[PDB]
Design an enzyme around this catalytic site. Structure first.
Site, PDB file in Angstrom:
ATOM      1  N   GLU A   1       1.040  -0.505  -0.159  1.00 47.86           N
ATOM      2  CA  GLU A   1      -0.117  -0.131  -0.304  1.00 47.86           C
ATOM      3  C   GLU A   1       1.301   1.439   0.148  1.00 47.86           C
ATOM      4  O   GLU A   1       0.487   2.303  -0.529  1.00 47.86           O
ATOM      5  CB  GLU A   1      -1.388   0.226   1.020  1.00 47.86           C
ATOM      6  CG  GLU A   1      -1.662   0.916   0.567  1.00 47.86           C
ATOM      7  CD  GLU A   1      -3.095  -0.397  -0.027  1.00 47.86           C
ATOM      8  OE1 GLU A   1      -3.011  -1.139  -0.465  1.00 47.86           O
ATOM      9  OE2 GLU A   1      -3.672   1.369  -0.313  1.00 47.86           O
TER      10      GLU A   1
ATOM     11  N   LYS B   1       2.577   2.157  -3.362  1.00 48.38           N
ATOM     12  CA  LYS B   1       1.709   2.237  -4.768  1.00 48.38           C
ATOM     13  C   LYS B   1       1.894   3.383  -4.727  1.00 48.38           C
ATOM     14  O   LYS B   1       1.731   4.520  -5.655  1.00 48.38           O
ATOM     15  CB  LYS B   1       0.873   1.435  -4.639  1.00 48.38           C
ATOM     16  CG  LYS B   1       0.219   0.076  -5.129  1.00 48.38           C
ATOM     17  CD  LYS B   1      -1.374  -0.157  -5.007  1.00 48.38           C
ATOM     18  CE  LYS B   1      -1.967  -0.128  -3.765  1.00 48.38           C
ATOM     19  NZ  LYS B   1      -3.721  -0.016  -3.856  1.00 48.38           N
ATOM     20  N   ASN B   2       0.955   4.323  -3.255  1.00 50.81           N
ATOM     21  CA  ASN B   2       0.920   6.209  -2.951  1.00 50.81           C
ATOM     22  C   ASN B   2       3.298   6.734  -3.557  1.00 50.81           C
ATOM     23  O   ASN B   2       2.607   6.910  -3.854  1.00 50.81           O
ATOM     24  CB  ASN B   2       0.947   6.205  -1.529  1.00 50.81           C
ATOM     25  CG  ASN B   2      -0.592   5.504  -1.286  1.00 50.81           C
ATOM     26  OD1 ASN B   2      -1.138   6.787  -1.762  1.00 50.81           O
ATOM     27  ND2 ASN B   2      -0.779   4.574  -0.600  1.00 50.81           N
TER      28      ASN B   2
HETATM   29  C1  LIG Z   1       6.673   7.152   1.191  1.00 45.99           C
HETATM   30  C2  LIG Z   1       5.169   6.437   1.026  1.00 45.99           C
HETATM   31  N1  LIG Z   1       4.988   7.290   0.569  1.00 45.99           N
HETATM   32  C3  LIG Z   1       3.777   8.007   0.201  1.00 45.99           C
HETATM   33  C4  LIG Z   1       2.642   7.572   1.894  1.00 45.99           C
HETATM   34  C5  LIG Z   1       1.043   7.659   1.630  1.00 45.99           C
HETATM   35  F1  LIG Z   1       0.553   6.246   2.463  1.00 45.99           F
HETATM   36  C6  LIG Z   1       0.616   8.572   0.739  1.00 45.99           C
HETATM   37  C7  LIG Z   1       1.479   9.210   0.071  1.00 45.99           C
HETATM   38  C8  LIG Z   1       2.795   9.269   0.333  1.00 45.99           C
HETATM   39  N2  LIG Z   1       3.323   9.697  -0.646  1.00 45.99           N
HETATM   40  C9  LIG Z   1       2.772  10.913  -1.452  1.00 45.99           C
HETATM   41  O1  LIG Z   1       2.996  11.619  -1.820  1.00 45.99           O
HETATM   42  C10 LIG Z   1       1.566  10.901  -0.526  1.00 45.99           C
HETATM   43  C11 LIG Z   1       1.423  11.689   0.288  1.00 45.99           C
HETATM   44  N3  LIG Z   1       0.674  10.663  -1.998  1.00 45.99           N
HETATM   45  C12 LIG Z   1       0.517   9.499  -2.323  1.00 45.99           C
HETATM   46  C13 LIG Z   1      -0.401   9.949  -3.664  1.00 45.99           C
HETATM   47  C14 LIG Z   1      -1.877  10.586  -3.625  1.00 45.99           C
HETATM   48  C15 LIG Z   1      -1.673  11.093  -2.681  1.00 45.99           C
HETATM   49  N4  LIG Z   1      -3.111  11.207  -2.019  1.00 45.99           N
HETATM   50  C16 LIG Z   1      -4.053  12.414  -2.108  1.00 45.99           C
HETATM   51  C17 LIG Z   1      -3.035  14.024  -2.617  1.00 45.99           C
HETATM   52  C18 LIG Z   1      -3.415  14.738  -2.229  1.00 45.99           C
HETATM   53  C19 LIG Z   1      -5.283  15.566  -2.107  1.00 45.99           C
HETATM   54  C20 LIG Z   1      -5.647  16.343  -1.652  1.00 45.99           C
HETATM   55  O2  LIG Z   1      -6.613  16.611  -1.068  1.00 45.99           O
HETATM   56  O3  LIG Z   1      -4.942  17.553  -2.796  1.00 45.99           O
HETATM   57  C21 LIG Z   1      -5.928  14.221  -2.097  1.00 45.99           C
HETATM   58 CL1  LIG Z   1      -7.914  14.010  -0.944  1.00 45.99          CL
HETATM   59  C22 LIG Z   1      -5.466  12.869  -2.507  1.00 45.99           C
HETATM   60  C23 LIG Z   1      -0.760  11.394  -1.003  1.00 45.99           C
END
Ligand code: A1EQI
Ligand code: A1EQI
Ligand code: TF3
Ligand code: TF3
Lengths: 352, 352
Positions: free
Chosen positions: A228, A231-232
């Protein structure tokens, strides 16, 4: 609540250490049966009573009623064995068959409760107080479900078929699981994006610096959490570097100390502002109508429950404009790795 | 409570943004006077009412009574100016003199409340519920004190004496403050230990990658936070590497994004288990009888209040057997940098 739920809900769940799971490896099977024919009703009833503390405008919705109908049937399935003879080997076989039916019956519980979250969001709203209550309830509900599945998996895996003991590996090579999960995320990232970050792993075995780091753990839980996170990390890295020819790699450090075994994953995927981190762990804000990333499904907050289930944690800290770190904290010793179980009492009753 | 505390406690504090502080730079001085002769009584009364929600076995102790006696006198000192003439320049001079007396009167408030924590620990005990209540109260009490000192410092610095505006630097070079704080911690570390880690700084200005990172901030607050973190990082590095010839350096990254300005400090000082992190932020567990490191005084939790005071945060994540990271999160824009002020209402009343 019915008679049978009332009886078993006055017991509290009995948490097991990883060492106890392991020390439990014939006579074992009868011992597992008589333990689980009491403990599974206790765990089922305690969470059913807690579901009943939800207000009527949540309780009466179709999703919650369907989940209740499943738990009720599973509780009844098990209560059939209360009077049966553990010496009769047909009873032990029927027991295993019944646990398999129960596990299959519950396979859709996570998205079913999601539909209840979704209905509430759009019929009563998505304010912070509603968010807090959904977060409190689902963390406990999903953790309870994880502990029930663990118990069932240990029985059906051991007493249907030893380096592994059911779902536990007493010699789990952590970096190997890291590599597996990375390879699998990379394969999805290579497919969607023709490009994926490379992986750097470093180990720090503080007490024995040349020795590969092993632990007693449930490697399928560890794989899920890592996958998980990977993937992020990859998605963020690909999207933040549209203009670079280089994709920065993802770095992982595995540290073994006297009490903790810690896994830090580091990306350079551009980060997010601190304000958004809480959004990423929230069930309510991550819920929408039917590869779900952080903020758009339950993968991340359920991954954190897997870490907490044996007294660990999963934490995120980002640096907007640069990248994000994630740390999985695990207990290093099997005697500290003890189930974390919600209980129905007056202390849980008051939160509602 | 007396009449005058009752009146001013029904107002809530008015939080100011960093931009408002700055936009306030003659006619300014009269404007500051008439704002502060109302706002300082409001902030003083709100916290005094909250002190009065402590149980009698805390309220009646000598430390709490001495702090109350100070706040009472400061509130009375200010109420003398309510009827006075802002055009009379002697009134403005007496006002500044009175604010200086008040600031000096309160100089010992932090260790005085510590003696109250210490007395409680040994006369009623140090259980988790007591810890939670002390943590809730002192975070709010110390944050309130920080906001009162800020207001007073801005007035006495501007209207007794411009690249700087009182205690605010509209062009605070963050890496320069990092270097200063590092140099000062190093000097203490060199003196006690004949050895100190070197410093590596990296900047990531996401929008303008070649531009040095500046912000609008209160640099004395930023220096204090960094110095507190550097002292801990160096001590940990020295003590964990008794046997190495090498001391690993301390690394700092400064990232500027669209919303956050983040400072991550990294040591290789061996880390601590996750279980102990909460101990390090706890006033109660850090309290003992009269260079205090994390866990042995209030430097770390008060450093976190400085970050929160303008909507930031200060977070720690360690890896036992390897090292520890600390991140200071600041708002990048002066319009987002708004005072975080506790309020006395029925929502605060209920927590007690
Ligand atoms: C070392 C592991 N890395 C990470 C682990 C994470 F569990 C989360 C992230 C990681 N690395 C990121 O950059 C992070 C933070 N993203 C990954 C891509 C998707 C992204 N999601 C989002 C982004 C912005 C908004 C918004 O409100 O604008 C929203 Cl709803 C959702 C989160
Ligand atoms: C990048 C910045 N680095 C850090 C920042 C911190 F604010 C804290 C730490 C850092 N780096 C460490 O190693 C850390 C965690 N220590 C520093 C030396 C003192 C130490 N205090 C202790 C240690 C153990 C116990 C115990 O219960 O055994 C107790 Cl009470 C107190 C904390
Ligand atoms: C479907 C599941 C996951 C779900 C969906 C939605 C919710 C929302 O639950 C709430 C919302 C508000 C309040 C405050 C209140 O006003 N309480 C009144 C008490 N009668 C309490 C609860 Cl338990 C929980 C769980
Ligand atoms: C000196 C200061 C910093 C200090 C020292 C000590 C404390 C301890 O404060 C407590 C301790 C226990 C309880 C629970 C309880 O039983 N409440 C009973 C309510 N009557 C409430 C409070 Cl506010 C606070 C602040």
């Amino acid at each position: 609540a019915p008679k049978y739920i009332e009886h078993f809900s006055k017991f509290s769940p009995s948490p097991l250490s990883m060492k106890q799971f392991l020390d439990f490896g014939n006579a074992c099977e009868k011992t597992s049966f008589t333990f689980l024919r009491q403990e599974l009703p206790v765990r089922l009833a305690n969470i059913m009573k807690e579901i009943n503390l939800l207000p009527d405008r949540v309780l009466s919705t179709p999703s919650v009623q369907l989940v209740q109908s499943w738990y009720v049937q599973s509780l009844l399935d098990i209560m059939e064995f209360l009077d049966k003879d553990p010496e009769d080997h047909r009873t032990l076989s029927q027991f295993t068959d019944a646990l398999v039916t129960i596990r299959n019956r519950h396979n859709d519980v996570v998205p079913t409760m999601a539909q209840g979250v979704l209905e509430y969001k759009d019929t009563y709203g998505d304010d912070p107080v509603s968010n807090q209550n959904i977060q409190y309830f689902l963390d406990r509900f999903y953790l309870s479900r994880i502990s029930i599945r663990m118990l069932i998996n240990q029985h059906t895996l051991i007493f249907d078929g030893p380096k592994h003991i059911g779902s536990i590996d007493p010699n789990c090579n952590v970096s190997e699981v890291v590599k597996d999960a990375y390879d699998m995320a990379k394969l999805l990232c290579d497919k969607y994006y023709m490009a994926s970050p490379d992986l750097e792993i470093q180990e720090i075995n503080a007490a024995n610096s040349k020795q590969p780091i092993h632990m007693v753990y449930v490697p399928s839980h560890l794989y899920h959490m890592l996958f998980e996170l990977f993937k992020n990390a990859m998605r963020a890295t690909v999207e933040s570097h549209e203009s670079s020819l280089i994709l920065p790699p993802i770095k992982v450090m595995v540290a073994l100390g006297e009490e903790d075994l810690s896994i830090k994953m580091s990306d350079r995927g551009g980060g997010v502002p601190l304000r958004k981190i809480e959004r990423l762990f929230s069930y309510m804000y991550s819920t929408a109508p039917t590869t779900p990333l952080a903020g758009f499904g339950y993968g991340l907050p359920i991954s954190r429950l897997y870490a907490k289930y044996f007294q660990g944690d999963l934490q995120l800290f980002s640096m907007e404009g640069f990248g994000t770190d994630a740390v999985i904290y695990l207990k290093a010793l099997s005697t500290d790795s003890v189930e974390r179980l919600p209980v129905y009492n007056k202390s849980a009753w008051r939160h509602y």
